[PDB]
Amino acid sequence: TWEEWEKKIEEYTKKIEEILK
Amino acid sequence: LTWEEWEKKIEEYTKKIEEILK
Amino acid sequence: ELTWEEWEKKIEEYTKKIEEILK
Amino acid sequence: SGIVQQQNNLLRAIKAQQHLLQRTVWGIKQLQARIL
Amino acid sequence: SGIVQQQNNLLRAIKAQQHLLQRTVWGIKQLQARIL
Amino acid sequence: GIVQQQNNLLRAIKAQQHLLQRTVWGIKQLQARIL
């Protein structure tokens, strides 16, 4: 599902930005 | 380059990366 | 609002920026 | 903040970027199936 | 060029690859909206 | 050690760069097909 897909995108995105602070 | 050659090249590099993170 | 051709250039810009950092 | 912690940090960023990349692959494949 | 310099190199490459990843996400979402 | 871990990260980033290029190619393929 694109709704499922969209959420995982913004999940892993903010996880990365937190890692690169 | 076909979409079948694209899928394999992806999976090829995919397994190559995960094996690096072993 | 970013247009495909402005998108293509930004790809190339950052791509070359990667090769320069590795190479 | 030492070299060891930062290496652990970069590893984690790559691990998280690998998950992002996989999800983009799935998206392209989906579109390719619908378009073609 | 040494461990410190190589670590800064890797950090910079990872940061720019994240810019790449974000732009591929934007491209997929553009296609997906147009298709659907 | 740290040296063998840095070499690992270098190889992983370079191969991940290969991946990104081919996913760019896919987006460009679909985009050219639509327009």
Numbering used by the authors:
A (entry chain G): 116 to 136
B (entry chain H): 115 to 136
C (entry chain I): 114 to 136
D (entry chain E), E (entry chain D): 35 to 70
F (entry chain F): 36 to 70
Give sentences from the paper.
Then, three C-terminal heptad repeats (CHR) fold antiparalelly onto the trimeric coiled coil of the N-terminal heptad repeats (NHR) to adopt a thermostable six-helix bundle (6-HB) structure, which drives the viral and cellular membranes merger eventually leading to the occurrence of fusion. Peptides derived from the CHR or NHR regions of gp41 have potent anti-HIV activity by competitive binding to the counterpart (NHR or CHR) thus preventing the formation of viral 6-HB structure. Thus, we determined the crystal structures of HP23L and LP-11 bound to a target-mimic NHR peptide with the wild-type sequence or resistant mutations.
To this end, the peptide N36 with the E49K and L57R substitutions (designated N36KR) was synthesized and used to assemble the complex with HP23L for crystallization. The sequence of N36KR was built from Ser-35 to Leu-70 on two chains and from Gly-36 to Leu-70 on another chain of the N36KR trimer; the sequence of HP23L was built from Thr-116 to Lys-136 on one chain and from Leu-115 to Lys-136 on the second chain and from Glu-114 to Lys-136 on the third chain of the N36 trimer. However, the Lys-49 in the structure of HP23L/N36KR destroyed the salt bridge with His-53 thus damaged indirectly the hydrogen bond between His-53 on N36KR and Tyr-127 on inhibitor contributing the resistance. So the E49K mutation, together with its upstream His-53, downstream Arg-46 and Lys-136 on HP23L, greatly increased the positively charged repulsion near the mutation site, eventually resulting in instability of the 6-HB structure. However, the substitution of L57R dramatically disrupted the hydrophobic interactions between Leu-115 and Leu-57. The disruption of three major hydrogen bonds in the hook region extremely decreased the NHR-binding stability of the inhibitors thus contributing the resistance.
